[PDB]
Design a protein around this ligand. Structure first.
Ligand SMILES: [Mg+2]
Ligand SMILES: [Mg+2]
Ligand SMILES: [Mg+2]
Ligand SMILES: [Mg+2]
Ligand SMILES: [Mg+2]
Ligand SMILES: [Mg+2]
Ligand SMILES: [Mg+2]
Ligand SMILES: [Mg+2]
Ligand SMILES: [Mg+2]
Ligand SMILES: [Mg+2]
Ligand SMILES: [Mg+2]
Ligand SMILES: [Mg+2]
Ligand SMILES: [Mg+2]
Ligand SMILES: [Mg+2]
Ligand SMILES: [Mg+2]
Ligand SMILES: [Mg+2]
Ligand SMILES: [Mg+2]
Ligand SMILES: [Mg+2]
Ligand SMILES: [Mg+2]
Ligand SMILES: [Mg+2]
Ligand SMILES: [Mg+2]
Ligand SMILES: [Mg+2]
Ligand SMILES: [Mg+2]
Ligand SMILES: [Mg+2]
Ligand SMILES: [Mg+2]
Ligand SMILES: [Mg+2]
Ligand SMILES: [Mg+2]
Ligand SMILES: [Mg+2]
Ligand SMILES: [Mg+2]
Ligand SMILES: [Mg+2]
Ligand SMILES: [Mg+2]
Ligand SMILES: [Mg+2]
Ligand SMILES: [Mg+2]
Ligand SMILES: [Mg+2]
Ligand SMILES: [Mg+2]
Ligand SMILES: [Mg+2]
Ligand SMILES: [Mg+2]
Ligand SMILES: [Mg+2]
Ligand SMILES: [Mg+2]
Ligand SMILES: [Mg+2]
Ligand SMILES: [Mg+2]
Ligand SMILES: [Mg+2]
Ligand SMILES: [Mg+2]
Ligand SMILES: [Mg+2]
Ligand SMILES: [Mg+2]
Ligand SMILES: [Mg+2]
Ligand SMILES: [Mg+2]
Ligand SMILES: [Mg+2]
Ligand SMILES: [Mg+2]
Ligand SMILES: [Mg+2]
Ligand SMILES: [Mg+2]
Ligand SMILES: [Mg+2]
Ligand SMILES: [Mg+2]
Ligand SMILES: [Mg+2]
Ligand SMILES: [Mg+2]
Ligand SMILES: [Mg+2]
Ligand SMILES: [Mg+2]
Ligand SMILES: [Mg+2]
Ligand SMILES: [Mg+2]
Ligand SMILES: [Mg+2]
Ligand SMILES: [Mg+2]
Ligand SMILES: [Mg+2]
Ligand SMILES: [Mg+2]
Ligand SMILES: [Mg+2]
Ligand SMILES: [Mg+2]
Ligand SMILES: [Mg+2]
Ligand SMILES: [Mg+2]
Ligand SMILES: [Mg+2]
Ligand SMILES: [Mg+2]
Ligand SMILES: [Mg+2]
Ligand SMILES: [Mg+2]
Ligand SMILES: [Mg+2]
Ligand SMILES: [Mg+2]
Ligand SMILES: [Mg+2]
Ligand SMILES: [Mg+2]
Ligand SMILES: [Mg+2]
Ligand SMILES: [Mg+2]
Lengths: 130, 122
RNA sequence: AGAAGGGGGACCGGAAUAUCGUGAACACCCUUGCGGUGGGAGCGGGAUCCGGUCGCAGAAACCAGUGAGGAGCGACUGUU
RNA sequence: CAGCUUGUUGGUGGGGUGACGGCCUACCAAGGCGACGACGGGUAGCCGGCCUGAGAGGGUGUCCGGCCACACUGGGACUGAGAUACGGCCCAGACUCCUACGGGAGGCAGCAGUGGGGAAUAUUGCACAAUGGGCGCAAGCCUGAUGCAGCGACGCCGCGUGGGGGAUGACGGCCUUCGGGUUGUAAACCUCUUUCACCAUCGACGAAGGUCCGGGUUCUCUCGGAUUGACGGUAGGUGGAGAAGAAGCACCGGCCAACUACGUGCCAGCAGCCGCGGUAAUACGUAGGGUGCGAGCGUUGUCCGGAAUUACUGGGCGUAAAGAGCUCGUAGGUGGUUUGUCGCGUUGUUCGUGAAAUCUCACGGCUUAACUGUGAGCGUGCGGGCGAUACGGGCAGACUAGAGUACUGCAGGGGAGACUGGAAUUCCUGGUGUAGCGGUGGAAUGCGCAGAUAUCAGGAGGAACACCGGUGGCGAAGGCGGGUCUCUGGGCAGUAACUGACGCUGAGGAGCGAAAGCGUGGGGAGCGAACAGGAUUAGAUACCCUGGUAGUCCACGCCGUAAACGGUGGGUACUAGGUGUGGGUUUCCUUCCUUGGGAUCCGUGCCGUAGCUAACGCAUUAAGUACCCCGCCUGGGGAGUACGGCC
RNA sequence: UCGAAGGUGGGAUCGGCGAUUGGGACGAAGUCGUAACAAGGUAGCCGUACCGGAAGGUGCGGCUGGAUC
């Protein structure tokens, strides 16, 4: 069980592919922050944290369009534990030429590409959500 | 794959085989051109290709190819050799320049007039 | 295999009065003995370094392995 | 190339240096370097730069600039602020030369040039006119640095080899359906311009500069009298008649733009591939026509790209090349939740630095461009200060989920040792008994008649354990069942009893590891390589038959190889179902006896959803979606072979 | 004292030639066989041992990348 961020992304991608309407996984502060960013970006619906038998479990509800259409096109972790990915303000990564969002972990907290470029501080690119 | 394994053992480009071994660094090598004869090419060609044994100033013996309609070649001769593939002969990988120190340009040559040796007119 | 092939070797002086190592007298305690500890005299031994001296030659005379390479036969020590 | 070092590592006291220092010396310790590759071998001047590539990257160090190293080879000292001291010195070696034989002199990797090698790379020219450097108070002197000139299409740029009417469809050539068209407005004919060439003339900027004089007294300044340019009478301008003085080159089958005919008939021949030429060649030589470029066009030599065919960007490993035979574990890489601290990684700002030219934007000057000057980017980085702890990380803690331990049950051909049982084959002994037995598609070799095959009874001996038995179970893999006993391993289920990230993988390394084979002793019923005879066949060194040795067996060692396969590495998370089997547990339907159905865990089969795949197929036991670790591949042979090394 | 050059010696490493000899690749239209592709006429492969002119054959153990009831 390595890279819980990758595990969370993989679970979300699998559920979105299988048209699942609910996911469950143990809760962490980083996962909660990522859920907040996703909710702000509008790729997901509401999220909540519920106390399981051990620790806490973080719950994400997904969103679907009019037909059986997935708002989430795909997921891709970026900064793997095998090789970390760091980016600066002048060369912030672009996802889908601006149509995608990359989570940036800077001293101001977890931030999106455009917001991080606005304030000019870079960090570690966690993943691409696009 | 496995960036850690790549760090431990990096990638390596393919091994290379040189093609100008006899010339060993020269576009043209001056040879001796001893024992000019003629051999037969591979099966589905059935020709009589004029070849020679030419030893360069780099002291290597190779079998070269004589292009053009006939030649004035003989025993050891003051010739120049360039690279080239024949695609029919077993191991001929060099060609003698026609219109060199000794060999003459191919007579009656009007088309392309540079290869095989040909003055325009005079 | 002492493979092969090299280097040194005499004498005098100093180090050097426990220099070092051998044994251990006078003189030091106790269950007093053919006893124990310390002690270091006198007497012997070996090695090393530095300086000097002599000769043609320092293993000094006597004494005291020649070495290497390729084959055959018998494995070897022995026996005739 | 797996072990390297002894002034070597350190210390002490001196010596030495401009200066720290085993730099040197006397003494003391045993240390120092090495898998992040020392030591060893091959190769090489480094960088700014140059080329290619969208980029990352790949190649390279030549002009120029910065540095380093060297001056016939090797070694050494001195002078001096400062020495690889090219045109300084001493010595050793080689070479060349003079000589009266005793002795002496010399070093173009300075400029120019000669010999030799190579495919091949230039004048024994001018001047200090300007800049820099050295010597004086200077005036001045030197400078093969430098400024130029000469040779080369060697590279970049630029301009010409003309233009305006021209269907005489010149003539002709070419193709030819004998009609025609192509060459083709280009031509002749009428005309315009003279770019660069030829001839004559003027004539430079480069010099707000240096000398001898006039204000200045010398310090500063302009003034003119004289002179000072190698380039150079050169650039450049002007004046003169005349299109008159001026183009060639490669290719034309696909890649890739360019077709007809003649001669030829696997011959001449061409070619980058694959393919054309052996009697109608758009592929050979030639003629015409066309395409593209141009004072250049093709070939050769090498690098980059196409090549995502070494893949960070940007590859794969079931069957195409690719998972070690399996397991353990050293280093290493990587890692659950949560709190606090630091701020090392991370990131922001600021300062210093990141030379110039060259790369780019924007301009300025050579008639334009090449060339050159200026402003800004580039210089991906580094050092310093000042902000952050969102993530990784260090430290200090905490939790139980991971992992491990605990207790109670469960299944098992898991393994080792010892004892023991039956069937069957063979053999031995005896009885009954006579002429066949065995073998094949058919036979024969073979066995018996000296009593065989067959039958009965008893005994001896080795091997293997029918039925259970299966699609099943166990084991890391290989493998594992006649029975009993002893010793011992692992797994699963349940409670959550306990610790608290103690986890995953694992380079090397270590252990285990079918059959065959090897060493030592024993054993040998049956089978059975080798071998022998018979039979088939042209042959039969085989398939078939008759025999038969090692071996197969035991004990202890060795060997470490298999299609050792799921042709699929280990661990984890997630991703419809349907239907068998095995070990548990659990309430309920609890008697609906049903040991059935339902729930959960650990497996083992098949079918099937999405997804993946070249397809076959995989599909919760993935070859699907992701992460961490290790192993492996870069066309086929040669070859898993040679040499070396380890066993 | 150190110290270039030189001499003496045993080694280390890299090449060239070598009587003779082993295997490999390619050639032509040769000789001897048919081992594999069909159940290829005795199924084919994998490791080992032995044998034979040669491909190959046999034994032991394993796989189906074959079939059978
Ligand atoms: Mg990759
Ligand atoms: Mg000796
Ligand atoms: Mg000997
Ligand atoms: Mg003397
Ligand atoms: Mg003796
Ligand atoms: Mg012999
Ligand atoms: Mg003897
Ligand atoms: Mg013998
Ligand atoms: Mg010392
Ligand atoms: Mg000292
Ligand atoms: Mg060099
Ligand atoms: Mg590319
Ligand atoms: Mg030198
Ligand atoms: Mg010289
Ligand atoms: Mg020298
Ligand atoms: Mg001076
Ligand atoms: Mg001095
Ligand atoms: Mg010198
Ligand atoms: Mg000098
Ligand atoms: Mg000189
Ligand atoms: Mg010169
Ligand atoms: Mg040459
Ligand atoms: Mg020459
Ligand atoms: Mg001057
Ligand atoms: Mg000057
Ligand atoms: Mg030329
Ligand atoms: Mg074309
Ligand atoms: Mg013809
Ligand atoms: Mg042609
Ligand atoms: Mg290429
Ligand atoms: Mg590439
Ligand atoms: Mg590939
Ligand atoms: Mg295959
Ligand atoms: Mg394969
Ligand atoms: Mg395996
Ligand atoms: Mg294998
Ligand atoms: Mg193997
Ligand atoms: Mg470890
Ligand atoms: Mg660890
Ligand atoms: Mg963590
Ligand atoms: Mg760690
Ligand atoms: Mg301009
Ligand atoms: Mg700069
Ligand atoms: Mg800073
Ligand atoms: Mg647990
Ligand atoms: Mg046993
Ligand atoms: Mg018997
Ligand atoms: Mg009987
Ligand atoms: Mg009987
Ligand atoms: Mg506790
Ligand atoms: Mg492990
Ligand atoms: Mg290992
Ligand atoms: Mg065996
Ligand atoms: Mg045996
Ligand atoms: Mg035996
Ligand atoms: Mg026989
Ligand atoms: Mg038989
Ligand atoms: Mg038998
Ligand atoms: Mg044997
Ligand atoms: Mg073993
Ligand atoms: Mg097996
Ligand atoms: Mg894999
Ligand atoms: Mg796996
Ligand atoms: Mg798995
Ligand atoms: Mg099941
Ligand atoms: Mg299926
Ligand atoms: Mg596949
Ligand atoms: Mg081998
Ligand atoms: Mg070997
Ligand atoms: Mg030979
Ligand atoms: Mg056959
Ligand atoms: Mg066969
Ligand atoms: Mg047959
Ligand atoms: Mg067969
Ligand atoms: Mg046989
Ligand atoms: Mg076999
Ligand atoms: Mg078999």
């Amino acid at each position: 069980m390595t890279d819980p961020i990758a595990d969370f992304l993989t679970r979300l991608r699998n559920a979105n592919s299988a048209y699942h309407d609910e996911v469950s996984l143990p809760h962490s502060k980083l996962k909660a922050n990522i859920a907040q960013i996703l909710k702000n970006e509008g790729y997901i619906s509401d999220f909540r944290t519920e106390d399981a038998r051990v620790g806490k479990s973080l719950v994400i509800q997904l969103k679907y369009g009019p037909s059986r259409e997935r708002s989430i096109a795909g997921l891709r972790r970026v900064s793997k534990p095998g090789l970390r990915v760091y980016a600066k303000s002048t060369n912030l990564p672009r996802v889908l030429g601006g149509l995608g969002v990359a989570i940036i972990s800077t001293s101001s907290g977890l931030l999106t590409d455009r917001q991080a470029a606005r304030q000019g501080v870079g960090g570690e690119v966690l993943a691409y959500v696009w | 794959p496995t960036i850690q394994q790549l760090v431990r053992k990096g990638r390596r480009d393919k091994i290379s085989k040189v093609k100008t071994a006899a010339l060993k660094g020269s576009p043209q090598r001056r040879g001796v051109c001893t024992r000019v004869y003629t051999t037969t090419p591979k099966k589905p060609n059935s020709a009589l290709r004029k070849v020679a044994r030419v030893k360069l100033t780099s002291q290597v013996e190779v079998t070269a190819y004589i292009p053009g309609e006939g030649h004035n070649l003989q025993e050891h001769s003051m010739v120049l050799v360039r690279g080239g593939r024949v695609k029919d002969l077993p191991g001929v990988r060099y060609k003698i320049i026609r219109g060199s120190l000794d060999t003459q340009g191919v007579k009656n040559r009007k088309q392309a007039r540079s290869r095989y040796g040909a003055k325009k007119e005079k």
